[model samples]
Target: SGAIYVGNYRVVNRHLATHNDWANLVWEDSSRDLLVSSTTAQGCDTIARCDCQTGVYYCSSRRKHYPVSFSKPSLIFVEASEYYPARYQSHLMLAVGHSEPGDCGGILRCQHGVVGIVSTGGNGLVGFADVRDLLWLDEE
Candidate 1:
């Protein structure tokens, strides 16, 4: 059995989109984490990932399911993590084609600010939970 622990995380808050119930937002608390230092493009709404292996990446969110991939996240959406210190205007989800499962609570970003988070998807489309009136807190 191959087990790759990305990071131990705890959920702080979660919600579904008003219109799209499949879309969701989540918050978490963590001390040690990871980051990608490469320059990200702004025009493509691609569902990005930083996986150690392409094996079965397990998840409690979305009911223990796995993602194929994500297309364009959304017009008003960015792809941010669901952990602490995750902020606005991070990155965008530009890929909107045949893709993988999304980490629910994953922050969605746009050029101006955060648009929403990854909820779930099907039929070659990934849904996003909007965060128009949400607030963000950072660790000092």
Candidate 2:
């Protein structure tokens, strides 16, 4: 037999476009934690995991942006783990995208930077990572 644990999840923003810049889509998990990513004109897609608890974000990928030509979808994996202090119990996985031709409008929601744009192309699949740890957390 299998048990199920349900929690709240939502895409906070969609169709986030920045004027003369890039845009992002934000998502929230059951614990009301937020994750953000961006889309660009040059077909660059990037994802960043945000740790609201610590107020720190990291870039998981070395590339500034994910190139659409790579034939592989940009990937980012993040999990919230328990910290020793208990005050900072969450951590994040940050993924960057390929650089664009133009300047990314100043939208500094994440560490690398934020740009507003109409879309992030390739099916707005946000906050969808196959992480094994999620199951353990759900059980706890």
Candidate 3:
């Protein structure tokens, strides 16, 4: 069987009623990655996916048995294959989403000037509708 996602929640192959996959920052090291290690305000260093050696070190933990290393990706990319709207600053807060419309596309990666992102389905490679200040955005 294959996988397909429905409205809010429902997947055929490997699905989700919502974007729980994105929210948790899951991974697949050796195609079996793990999540970001958590810590506290004081001094709590935790790297769950770590396997250091004599002098050198590899942060990527082995999956099952074999050991491997990956040069960390300096650029993290987020892509939503379904439409998402800039939600109301009130309840939804300052985050956009992949909720409604239809099969969509959006990406987000940290950078200068273009600190955030959005692609209006057909608004070209690096452009959008009206570029407005985040502070004063009207009903989308």
Which candidate number would show the highest lDDT if scored against the true structure? 1
Instruction: Write down the RMSD of all candidates, one decimal each.
Output: 14.6, 16.7, 17.6
**Candidate 3 lDDT (Cα, whole model)?**
0.20
Tell me the spans in candidate 3 whose CA falls farther than 4 Å from its real position. Answer: 1-63, 81-140
Per-prediction TM-score, please? 0.29, 0.17, 0.16
Task: Give the candidates in order of TM-score, highest first.
Answer: 1, 2, 3
| Superposed model 1: Cα runs more than 4 Å off | 1-95, 98-102, 135-140
lDDT tens per residue, model 3, 1-140: 11111112211111122355435322212111111211122221111222221111111111111122222222222234332223211101112222221221121222111111122222212211111122211111
Candidate 2 RMSD to the real structure: 16.7
lDDT by residue (21-44, candidate 1, tens digit) is 122223321221211111122222
Against the true structure, candidate 3 reaches a TM-score of 0.16
Clashes of each: 28, 15, 11
lDDT of 2 by residue, 66-88 (tens): 32211122233323323112222
- Find the 10 residues in a row with the least total lDDT in model 2: 1-10
User: Which stretch of 10 consecutive residues in model 1 shows the poorest summed lDDT?
Assistant: 1-10
Where does candidate 2 stray beyond 4 Å?
A: 1-89, 98-130, 136-140
